[PDB]
Design a protein around this nucleic acid. Sequence first.
RNA 1: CUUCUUGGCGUAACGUUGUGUAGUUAAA
RNA 2: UUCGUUGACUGUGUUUACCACGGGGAAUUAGAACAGAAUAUCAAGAAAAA
RNA 3: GUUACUAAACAGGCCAGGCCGACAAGAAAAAAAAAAAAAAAAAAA
Lengths: 13, 183, 233, 281, 174, 94
Amino acid sequence: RAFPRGCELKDPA
Amino acid sequence: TRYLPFVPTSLVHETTSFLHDATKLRALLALIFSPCKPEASVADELASPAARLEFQQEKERYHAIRDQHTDCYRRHESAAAASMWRAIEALPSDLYEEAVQSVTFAPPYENEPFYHERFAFPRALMFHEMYGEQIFQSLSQLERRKLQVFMNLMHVRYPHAELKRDKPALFWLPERQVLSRQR
Amino acid sequence: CGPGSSRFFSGTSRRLSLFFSDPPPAYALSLHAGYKIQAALCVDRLPLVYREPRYEKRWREFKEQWEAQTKNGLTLADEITFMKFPFHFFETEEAQKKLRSLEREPERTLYLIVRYGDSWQFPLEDRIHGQSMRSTLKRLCSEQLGSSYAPFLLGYSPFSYAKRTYPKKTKEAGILGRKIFYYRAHHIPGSENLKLPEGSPVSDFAWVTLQELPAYISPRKLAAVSAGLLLEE
Amino acid sequence: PFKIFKASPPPAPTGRKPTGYRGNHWHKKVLYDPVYPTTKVPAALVPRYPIDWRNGGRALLIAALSKLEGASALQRRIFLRENSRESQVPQTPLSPFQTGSSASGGGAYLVSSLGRKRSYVGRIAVSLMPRHRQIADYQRVGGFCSPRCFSECSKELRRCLCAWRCTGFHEHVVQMDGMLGEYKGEVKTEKPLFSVLRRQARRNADPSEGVAFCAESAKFKSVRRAQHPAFEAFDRQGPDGPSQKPAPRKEPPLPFYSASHVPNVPRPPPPQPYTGPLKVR
Amino acid sequence: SYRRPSRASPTGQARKPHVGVRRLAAEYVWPGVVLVKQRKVIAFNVETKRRNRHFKLYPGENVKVSKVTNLVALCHGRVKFTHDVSRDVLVVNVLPERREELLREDLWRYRTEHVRSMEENRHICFLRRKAVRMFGKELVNPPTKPPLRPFYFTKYDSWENPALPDVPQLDDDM
Amino acid sequence: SLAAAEQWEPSPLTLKQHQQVVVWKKDRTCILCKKEVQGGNVEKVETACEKAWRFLSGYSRSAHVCPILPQMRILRYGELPLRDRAKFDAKLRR
RNA sequence: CUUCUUGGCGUAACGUUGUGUAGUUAAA
RNA sequence: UUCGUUGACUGUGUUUACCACGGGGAAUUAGAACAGAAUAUCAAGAAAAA
RNA sequence: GUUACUAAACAGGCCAGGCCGACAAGAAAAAAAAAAAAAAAAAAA
Ligand code: FES
Ligand code: FES
């Protein structure tokens, strides 16, 4: 199953 | 009427003069802040590297040996406390109330107008009373001077230790005469 | 360990009342879960002479000498050293140039032990229903040890407790056993020794050190009391 | 004399900031309430008398006495108290090093100090007594032997001998006397506290029963009368059941009429916690 | 000679306090929403008063305390209330959840309940919560349209306008 | 036992372990002394600062005698970790 | 092994706008 | 401890509780991002045979 | 799921519009002891 993304994956890298 | 505690200057004349005399004040302050060597400039040293190295070595040895020695006493005290609390817990609920009251217990004071007798510590049980003569005979010159000064300052602090016992009424005055006095 | 009546005594009343209650007492007893409540007193005499450890003396003397060399010690001015009080004693060296005895074994600690017949134990008394353990201890002192013997009590709380269950025949009488609470006390120096009151259940008394205690008291009682007894090897 | 009609001293005036005059800053909530924060009183606004010999010279004399006795005695007393309050059960011996193999610590004070990273300088600063309450407490229990002699030495003139030469076995005597002489009941105060509360002894469940001998059966029997078993249970365990009528009136009925059914306040306060001794398992 | 009070007509107090809850149970809120309005001023004999204003509520899970002691939300979720028997006060919590349809079978999660400690309050919030952030859940009929427009433009916008395009919802998990 | 503890003769290894030592919490400069320090550095108590040694030994009633006294952490040599002991062995040799 | 704190206090919170003082324009 | 410190900062982003409007101003969010500077606090220290 | 806002009358009365560059902001740390006694220093950090 897919998983929700963490705080790291939401920063403007 | 109702009275309030007080200590008039006349009954304590000694300490007032002691603290108002400039030279005695200077001596007391020097004793408090001894030594009086300066500590502001960088060049102010009251010791030397070798001197304080030897002092540190001696202090470390002393602390190590004292910790090695007193640890057995500490363990024994821990065991004794465990036993005491176990016994108190084993006591019945009727005796619980008395078994937690400490030596100095006394019923509350009433301002009217298991406790058989007042608590009084035998003066013969004080450590310095039991071993006063031996320690005094084994003291040094500086220690004797220290004891003398300690005595004299104790007396200065408490000129009326016996007078309070003898005539306690001299230290209680009415409100209407106490509250009307400036500081 | 063995308090049996044969080893305790035969043909007496007050002594056997405490340990067996075979001659029933004249007062009301106090049971806690079927065990009679008793207070035990453990009076001690502190050493009469003072001993100081070498490391303490060495540290103190070295500090005094170091302070003298470095000129960092206390001032202690003459104006605060000499002001003519009745207790004044100081004077500069320059001006000077111009088994029942309390005195036994003064370098150790002693404990007062009591002989109930052939058994060596500590003073013991029963608690009468409704009275304080302090009152029980006072009665113990005044009736078993000496009418004028009043050692200093260290507190209202016991320092240890012990239990003893009676045999089948004795427990059939309605009392399962006796539970004892021990209390420490100090023999005030300069106070008179014991003087056994007439009719007191005590047969004899002694003042023994910790080392000699096991030579007289049973290992069970020693185990019960050693946790609270002071440390001295 | 000793017996006297003492006057109740007037309360000391707690200062206040000259602000917030229209609000009630003296709610009875506990610091630090998230929704009822307490207004602080700055130390610079607490009214204090000007310094004279009664408050300053006495402090100087007590400080000189402490100097003569040595700050090491005060440090040792504080350390002994702190270690005693935390080592009331048998501990395993603790060394201060992972490989010393011979050095012993000297108390759980070591564990506490390591855990809190306590300030070596801070202990000396405390022992030097920079605060009024500290000097006042030294004037009262300053004696080294206080755990066993309390304030009896507060005026003794040879008291410094204890500080100078009370060590080893004598320190052990002081501690053993103090453990038996200290209080072990409930403390009752409304003032704030933030430290580990001193121990309160647990209380046993059963009480003691009085028994007297009866020769008619040659056995010991209870002193108290029989009563019905239900009455015995009510007297021993409590009211029984989850609900009962209130206590019957013990005073003669009032001649006048009063609305005794009315509660004291429209909105009663919250229940108070049980601060008394706990039971024994 | 009657002293007319200053708060007589026409100079009475225009705006009333309006102290109390401003969001009911199960309502959806986001950070910054004032759950309860409260004031710092306190009456001089509070323990004798009876009006409900004087007795404040207490923050709980995902709730802050304001300068004037307002209780405000800190996460996207649904409101829940609890009763503290020990302190005899009401506690405001927010269970974190993403926007989705509020079903009848899920209403029990927002019941007001009795607790003895804030630890038990946190435990109950965890037990009633729907899902955790790190695992998420299958959203049941989540919204898909942009949010309501700013108040100063229009006060009476339409929720989930079918004429508007679908836009991603990437703010309600924070 | 107690007798052996009273008669204890500390070995030189034990004395070295009991050697006191200053560990610096943070970087800082002395205002009046101008000394420069780095956090985590280890020094001997005797030579680290004489003015601070005054308070640490009992010949000063002021805790501000050394301007960076609060940045000190006084530990015994035996308590230090192996890494720090090896790293600063040279400056702690006495 | 992401990050232990932080842009006052204020249970009366300062008079909005304007004028004046002051700030900004290698751009706006 | 008699302990530091000045975040009682400089800016970009028009999103947000309340609501006639004005004074987001009885005194709402990390608009959880971004560009600078500053202050305080680290962590680890495991293993004591027969 | 869920009971909470709400003082109109010249109704029964309240108001001091102010303090703080810091023991008043404030990191870390610390913080107030039953009864009785001693002391008569309005004293927790
Ligand atoms: S200070 Fe009281 S007997 Fe030592
Ligand atoms: S480091 Fe310079 S005076 Fe202490």
